[PDB]
Design a binder for this molecule. Structure first.
Ligand SMILES: Cc1cc2nc3c(=O)[nH]c(=O)nc-3n(C[C@H](O)[C@H](O)[C@H](O)COP(=O)(O)O)c2cc1C
Ligand SMILES: Cc1cc2nc3c(=O)[nH]c(=O)nc-3n(C[C@H](O)[C@H](O)[C@H](O)COP(=O)(O)O)c2cc1C
Ligand SMILES: Cc1cc2nc3c(=O)[nH]c(=O)nc-3n(C[C@H](O)[C@H](O)[C@H](O)COP(=O)(O)O)c2cc1C
Ligand SMILES: Cc1cc2nc3c(=O)[nH]c(=O)nc-3n(C[C@H](O)[C@H](O)[C@H](O)COP(=O)(O)O)c2cc1C
Ligand SMILES: O=C(O)C(=O)c1ccccc1
Ligand SMILES: O=C(O)C(=O)c1ccccc1
Ligand SMILES: O=C(O)C(=O)c1ccccc1
Ligand SMILES: O=C(O)C(=O)c1ccccc1
Ligand SMILES: O=C(O)C(=O)c1ccccc1
Ligand SMILES: O=C(O)C(=O)c1ccccc1
Ligand SMILES: O=C(O)C(=O)c1ccccc1
Ligand SMILES: O=C(O)C(=O)c1ccccc1
Ligand SMILES: [Mg+2]
Ligand SMILES: [Mg+2]
Ligand SMILES: [Mg+2]
Ligand SMILES: [Mg+2]
Lengths: 335, 335, 335, 335
């Protein structure tokens, strides 16, 4: 019984140890950017269209060479065994079954090859290592295992200052490890070029907020970008991605896929992102709430709920396809 | 003893079963659009004019070929026997006596012919059925019974997701039925044309928010539109009608009547809507509060209160007629 | 011991009967315009100037042919014996001693001739009567008694709907009467012309909010206007005067004095009004708080406090005169 | 254990007598300008850049002929022995050790020569005295003692009205004195010229908010300005410096250093100020919190925390230098 994504947060709040809930929920500094992701979405109103043909409403998109059932993918979230014993396998299985891409993390608590074996056409998120050769060996592993895109996270030259974790003195339980390993260095545009030169997979730069970085990403050969302030966990005071999305979509003028994340908590939010020009969204914390609450079945229920909310919102707004939703206009309101 | 519309909500809160109060009060999703209808009105301030001749102040308008006592009609609200045993008959009698149009619903709990027999020059609200022939037979029934406009609701390809109702497990009591029947399909512009071709009554499209849909409505032969997000019950995140009204009035440039609804709770709110260019408003939930609180006499008291508030507001703003009120300027403020 | 105007409200709250405090404090309808007077002032920030010569700072102005000690006058407030037994005489004595104009009301609870006999160069506020001849006889009385301006209130074709008073069932105590009498009709521009033709005193139109009404006031021969929504007691939803002031000052381009009222509660507020272009302000409710709290001495303390706050604010903003303060720039902020 | 500047306020709240905490925390009037300093910063969001070279991130700047370790100095705060027995010596020692300039006050509770003897290349803040000769003798003392800039405070023709202090009846303890003395007059542009003519040190005008005063400061030969409303302690209703900073930086077009203060409470806030164009910031109240909480070691911990936060924010925003941070763009958001 879940009728909104908020039902699942309460459930995850119930079950998780406090420090782990804080690791999941928290942001950096004063959490201004964390709160702003929600504020910014709540200010956006859609102008729906009426009286359109809705006899074949579809929420499917084509992205990075594959069909997805929704304009959504599961965001990279490290160490998912923190939230449930089956960790990444539970989430990847539910995503596969829902037809949603799953992003395998560099810091996954189950090896990328095991998660890829689940099936479901997965993506791989890269954090840049120490030396180019080991970074590229991670990319090669992912490609060999059947991952279909490399999501290179570019907003973490180092990790942000998460004060909840500092106050809690939070550290990984001994029962959770970085399963892809037996160290990290800041990524640069040179790093992006090294990755692009080493793979035929589309490279997606996650954590772009400046318009000129979006243009440079296209010039650098990126197949996509994720407009994102990393869920408010990196620079405290970084603008929400949803506030830069329209400008960025106009600037790249179809040169790559433009995704957005941060605070997506309903099908209506997905519609807002689409109306502002996103190709698709990522969803992070809610997927972990569902995982914590009820494992694989929990994530299944979440994705079924989001699928019904996206269909509902699209139809009510007169959109028989995600392309139509991208042509919707919006208006900024107050509170 | 009621000196504001808020007095009646408290009274209805007293008497109604909780689940029924929630069916009435609620919106879809997070109720963002429900709240925004009120927020948007509260941001609007009127710039009143002084020292005008007020020796013959009149709140009357001519609309769809008939005089109305106020620039207001009772909004379509389904299943009014949910709120009082006399249901639609109580409300239609009070509206008749007040000189206000009453909108008979497709999903009325008393048959449209019985309600029309009350008198008072009624309108009929259409939800599109299954097959064109039965939809048109409903329109023909309404016209035969003396209804004077067809209010075609165009923002309900299907019903919105009302989470209060889901959580309550709300369903119609066995003692409430759709009295016009012994099934629904999404309306399209083709449906509008079928209705327009089948009746001489003015067709009014209720649920228009996009400027180009307002233009297309005029091109399609509509006699009016209602700028409306369906009281925040349909797309959660849909812009309030009051925020689109000025743009829409400019775009149709007198080509049809432009009504607005959503959150009208006083004569001052009616004045704001008029100043932004509306021909008239619809009022929904407050009429049901009055019905729940005190039946026909309750609705009578509500309409008398609104009549005095509209006269008061118009005179204080220097307007001897509703046309003068439409020429008032406004200024947006904060909170 | 009062260091702010807020100290006096608490004191008046202590002493007054509840219904009388509500008559004083309240506004019309939902009190949106009452609250907005304060909101609007709080959004205004001054850009102060530094390093100016302040060796002869003066808060004096010349207005309607006379020097005033501050750019402020006591607003017309009817029936002041409601708040203290000495009523208008206490307030007029304190105003005289402070060098501030006092506005004698048509509905004063002490006769205008008695209040004028106090001295201090008083103004007279006119509500339009029944027939022109009696209205003009009131004006002639005021002029004969030595009043120096006629403040014609133009935003009261009838009194607003004050819901606190309705709920309280408030009426005048038998011990309070309209002392100028032993009936009212809406004023029009014809009424203004009748007054202008009948007196050599400057005519000041109180309750102007529309820019074209301000222009028309100058064309009609007004010596001043008060930009005002009547303390939020008339049209609920009327824009605050402070929000129209700049536009209006630009439109009259020195053709008459432009005063403002509504929510002035400190010397800093006086500075804001001046910086937006006002010649002077009126202050209403705070004067009655002081009267209720401590009679004549209370009003004296209030005016001494406001005088020190105005001097303080002007000097801190680099203004040696009120003219300099009118040349200050402002910036709108949030909350 | 301090992970934010807010940790230290709580600690100082613990230890200080209430009246002294109020002297430190308070502002003038209604404290509107005090609150607005924080509001204004919270509305600013940074647009970070990604994938830059961060192999030599440095937070150092050159200002007034000397290297500073951070783009920050300790603001002038009078009478620091109010907060800890070692007063100014504790703060100046910690600032020296951190490589941050310390501003010695005219109203210091330890003599300027003693504080300068601590070392660390100090600045001297001037309040204009009585007669030019004694003002200039203070400047000469400062220069003889090795101070490296004269921070002439120009927004205090007299002290603001601090209502907390009035209500508390706050006065200096007998154990705190103005140690530079054994009287004050408003400064003017003539005063600035007298100082400029009498010293070779850069003269920095603290308390500039108007764009034309910033231009005039450059024309007057100032080496810098501090855009500031004096922590909301002077004119209540004065615009926050952070709201004028961008305009002012554009207007002086490199003609002098432009500093800002008011509400800086984190390294992220320093980044915002830099992105809006500031050369550096001043920090006032937080330094006194640290002093009250733990003396010299407390101020050391505060400056170490701010240093780590500034480095963190700069790197996360892709800035290897403060110059790069000044080229960041910003976007205004809500709440
Ligand atoms: C606990 C947690 C761990 C995360 N780990 C990663 C990661 O390893 N790599 C990455 O690129 N983003 C990571 N993110 C950021 C997410 O991918 C996403 O950008 C962010 O959560 C915003 O989306 P949301 O509001 O839907 O959570 C993490 C976020 C959270 C909350
Ligand atoms: C309980 C309820 C039932 C409604 N039923 C209908 C309906 O059958 N047809 C329709 O077009 N609108 C229906 N509406 C929408 C109203 O006509 C109106 O658009 C909405 O209530 C906004 O106005 P308000 O804020 O004054 O309630 C209904 C609204 C409510 C609350
Ligand atoms: C109790 C009360 C009585 C008033 N009586 C009059 C009146 O007789 N004539 C008039 O022009 N305004 C009258 N006013 C309006 C004031 O002159 C003034 O416009 C208003 O109070 C706004 O100022 P404030 O916020 O400083 O109170 C009255 C206001 C109050 C609160
Ligand atoms: C207790 C206190 C004393 C101050 N004394 C002085 C002073 O003597 N000279 C001066 O120019 N500013 C003085 N200031 C203002 C500060 O230099 C600074 O402009 C202000 O505190 C804003 O910064 P903040 O928000 O970081 O405190 C004082 C501020 C405080 C709170
Ligand atoms: O990447 C992140 O968002 C962050 O939550 C994180 C923190 C530690 C390890 C891995 C990821
Ligand atoms: O040193 C770090 O902050 C480390 O946690 C990290 C992780 C991923 C990318 C860069 C750094
Ligand atoms: O139309 C509506 O607004 C809605 O409240 C409704 C729900 C069920 C049946 C009829 C109307
Ligand atoms: O299937 C529905 O949602 C049904 O309730 C309905 C009612 C009116 C119009 C369209 C659909
Ligand atoms: O004029 C007014 O503002 C109002 O308060 C009033 C009400 C009754 C009598 C006189 C004035
Ligand atoms: O009839 C009224 O509202 C009356 O109170 C009045 C008072 C002053 C001016 C106009 C009307
Ligand atoms: O300058 C100030 O900000 C103020 O706090 C002050 C008050 C008294 C003495 C010295 C400074
Ligand atoms: O008289 C004053 O306000 C005095 O405290 C002062 C202090 C510094 C500068 C100017 C005045
Ligand atoms: Mg998201
Ligand atoms: Mg309505
Ligand atoms: Mg006032
Ligand atoms: Mg500061």
């Amino acid at each position: 019984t879940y009728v909104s994504l908020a039902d699942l947060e309460r459930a995850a709040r119930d079950v998780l140890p406090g420090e782990i809930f804080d690791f999941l929920a928290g942001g950096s500094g004063t959490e201004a950017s964390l709160v702003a992701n929600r504020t910014a979405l709540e200010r956006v109103f859609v102008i729906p269209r009426m009286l359109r043909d809705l006899t074949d409403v579809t929420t499917e998109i084509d992205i990075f060479g594959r069909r997805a059932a929704l304009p959504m993918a599961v965001a990279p979230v490290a160490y998912q065994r923190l939230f449930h014993p089956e960790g990444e396998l539970a989430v990847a299985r539910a995503a596969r079954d829902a037809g949603v891409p799953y992003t395998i993390c560099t810091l996954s608590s189950v090896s990328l090859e095991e998660i890829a074996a689940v099936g479901g056409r997965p993506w791989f998120q890269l954090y840049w290592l120490r030396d180019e050769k080991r970074s590229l060996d991670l990319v090669r592993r992912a490609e060999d295992a059947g991952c279909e895109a490399i999501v290179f996270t570019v907003d973490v030259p180092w990790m942000g200052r998460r004060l909840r974790d500092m106050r809690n003195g939070f550290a990984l339980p001994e029962w959770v490890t970085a399963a892809n390993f037996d160290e990290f260095a800041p990524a640069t545009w040179e790093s992006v070029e090294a990755v692009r030169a080493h793979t035929d997979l589309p490279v997606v730069l996650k954590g772009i907020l400046a318009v000129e970085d979006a243009r440079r990403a296209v010039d650098a050969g990126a197949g996509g970008i994720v407009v994102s302030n990393h869920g408010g966990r990196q620079l405290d005071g970084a603008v929400p991605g949803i506030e830069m999305l329209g400008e960025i979509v106009a600037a790249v003028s179809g040169g790559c896929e433009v995704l957005v994340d941060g605070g997506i908590r309903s099908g209506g939010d997905v519609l807002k992102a689409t109306a502002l020009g996103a190709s698709a969204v990522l969803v992070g914390r809610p997927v972990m709430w569902a995982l914590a609450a009820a494992g694989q079945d929990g994530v299944r229920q979440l994705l079924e709920l989001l699928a019904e909310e996206v269909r509902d919102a699209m139809g009510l707004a007169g959109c028989e396809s995600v392309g139509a939703a991208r042509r919707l206009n919006t208006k900024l309101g107050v509170v």
